Subunit: 121 residues, 8 copies
């Protein structure tokens, strides 16, 4: 089963992070979310109820990203993957990638972040 | 067998979508199409008949994308994958990715979409 | 006097526009704001009070862009230029550029928009 | 008077050009159009009739670019500037930039093209 | 064994292609080449003789791409993969991706091309 | 006299800024420097002594940007323009643009900054 | 186990390389580092000690890249993978990609480089 | 008279430069050329003889850029401006911008270069 639903480069201004001044100031978080969902039925019926609404998915992601400051990207991604797997039975698996393109690290780079994959069991 | 024929970032203005005002206004759809085709014969003969014409493939994709408004990306991609697998025996598998970089979702992101993979059986 | 203060590519999701379905759905608006301000005093004192706070400027722009739906970019830019010239005596002139990269126009382009320049008299 | 209405990076597939094989094959043309129009009235009334409709402007540009193959970019831009200045009394001046990012010139570059400015008298 | 040597986005002006006017005019070809080579020995000795010289690899690719006009990308990639596998015993496998970002296809896209993978046996 | 020497998009990690947490954490500063220098003599002699060494210019800019934390971009740019005009008699004028692409401002934009122009008298 | 910690497009000015003039002049090296680490515990506790600090990882990478000139990318990547696997028990595997976008190779391309994957045993 | 003919981002591999190791290794040079030419006649006749052939212009630029190593960008641009003004009577003025995006300067930037403007008298 290789079909996916994706939301790519979602950007939220948040205050998450280990460092306190980091929580003070905040930064932009970029989030990719990929859902392993079987799409041939909705592909068959062209009815949205047969698939997972990507619109609703985005509001869920935003709630968490624009929610209470937490320490780790690992934790942020974990709560998004839960929220999504618990809300949508059709989702076999949830992949969550969170990037900080501009964290408090002196140097030159494009970004740093984590990615997790969480089967819905 | 890892050889492919691809068409990347095809852009069409269409009126597909769940929301009606969305069908009214329309938007740009970006489409990626990847075909699992065995290329060493055409690689051997340098004759186009031994491979799948990417030119013809594009007109097929455009017919569908610039065709009658449907509700779901899942459905649009499904009809492209059929059209292609039915027209070309050489295609072992068809992968179809459709992105809406600017759908009616209030927020900041790069795109949302689906991707499907359909073996030609 | 060639010194400026600028805010570039500000992006807001708004519902402005002539077409009603356009007001329904909304879209992303990109805004550039350039202020002709004489900077050598703040350049001398390194005191923020001698210059125009770009932070405050952004909230003003956002209020308008993320405010009540209006018909024209010409009108949106006009209210930003007023707001700014009226709030900040130091601003000799205000330039306001508003772009719709994805308006309801069927075709392929990077953007459409207006730009105005308004002296503070 | 520094206010403008602009349409940026419009892309059309056309067959214009000196070389015949060039007319045969065709290519993508990128067009920028900038109109010197006084916007403070429409800025005042928020009524579209007080300004030049950028939507209508685009169809004019497309008619010409996706029209009969001509030899020179100079000529293509000339007919767009006429069409526009003749259709819209409010336009004081029309600037037309046409780029061929991929003309029949062996080498490595981003583009080649012309730009003209035509007052509406 | 997951180590690779890669050359990415090589660009050559060539005249390859099915259409004759296409052979007449020519275009830019972008080539990606990825070699499955075991790198821990050269990783150990820091001696170039223990690895495949990417410099030499590029001249090989250029010879073919900037060589006699052929009909198909499938064929071009085939001759590069041979040339490379035959010249370098250390290469376990050769992957060759050739893209035409601007072929004679009327429409809007980022590119079309093929990709092949050829084990060195 | 329209000739210039330019250094574009120089990036430095610095701790400048009004906000203290901003001084704590730091950020990337992008700097553009444009020098109005008459180049036809060095254009004539191909001798570097007849022109301003852009290499040396960069070290000057870096000293300041990667120097003691100051409050304002206005002040940072002022010290670069001095340093340069005082060090190089040939420079008729110095233009200094400093951008913060990611300052502590909650929202979506490309950057904020100032630009100054300082004749060497 | 598909979770990763990544650092993407890190850029360092270094003098590594086979050619001596290359060691003389130096160039920019871009480095991607991907760590296969199991993140659900830190995902559970939101405590940094349960995961690998990406900040510390970057300083390690920089030490090596901005360290003594070596001949091969293969060797540079090898020392980064060691350094990391030896320092962090939690890392199951380390992937290191090093690109030279502008090496001493006459031609037009985006980059050349190597990528290695090293399990921590 | 504001009409121009332009060639943008031409890229050549050359060995120009002050430093000798720089002449040894070489680098990519990016060149912009803008010609102030009156285009309304060719705009009138659609005959190429009434305007300056941008194709021929490019070969001239390449001859110089891919010609004998010289010390300064100032000198390179000077010889291009001459060559062009001397060859084409119609050119009122020639603007030449030459950028080194990756010169031997340790640091992080987008480019350094010069720009000159030379009237054809
Ligand atoms: N794996 C992992 N490593 C980290 N290292 C440092 C920080 C801090 O929040 C800051 O120092 C940088 O944002 N966060 C993380 C994190 O969230 N995950
Ligand atoms: N998986 C999936 N989810 C969707 N959610 C909303 C919409 C609607 O057309 C619009 O609200 C957004 O385009 N379409 C889809 C869709 O086509 N697929
Ligand atoms: N100058 C100018 N021309 C316009 N033409 C059409 C529209 C409408 O809102 C829509 O049709 C497109 O967004 N708006 C404008 C506008 O705001 N300004
Ligand atoms: N100023 C100017 N110069 C030109 N040189 C060559 C060509 C031809 O159509 C082709 O050889 C390249 O597209 N066209 C032009 C042109 O349209 N304008
Ligand atoms: N798989 C494959 N399909 C193709 N379709 C058309 C063309 C022609 O050369 C031109 O019409 C387009 O470049 N070439 C190819 C090709 O090389 N490969
Ligand atoms: N003109 C001008 N306005 C500013 N507003 C806020 C800040 C502060 O350092 C921070 O709040 C944002 O970086 N700095 C400036 C500044 O340097 N210049
Ligand atoms: N696999 C591999 N091939 C190479 N070929 C040439 C060079 C030299 O340092 C220079 O000629 C180019 O940077 N280095 C390498 C290298 O580091 N790895
Ligand atoms: N204005 C100007 N300044 C320069 N500074 C250093 C170098 C040298 O060739 C090298 O050190 C850097 O490419 N060239 C120049 C140059 O060509 N122009």
């Amino acid at each position: 089963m290789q079909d996916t639903i994706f939301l790519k480069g979602m950007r939220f201004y948040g205050y998450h992070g280990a460092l306190s001044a980091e929580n003070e100031i905040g930064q932009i978080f970029k989030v990719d979310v990929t859902l392993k969902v079987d799409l041939s039925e909705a592909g068959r019926t062209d009815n949205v109820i047969d698939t997972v609404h990507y619109g609703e998915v985005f509001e869920e992601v935003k709630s968490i990203m624009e929610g209470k400051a937490v320490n780790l990207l690992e934790h942020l991604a974990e709560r998004i993957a839960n929220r999504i797997n618990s809300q949508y039975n059709r989702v076999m698996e949830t992949k969550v990638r969170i990037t900080k393109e501009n964290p408090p690290i002196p140097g030159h780079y494009d970004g740093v972040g984590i990615e997790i994959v969480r089967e819905n069991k």
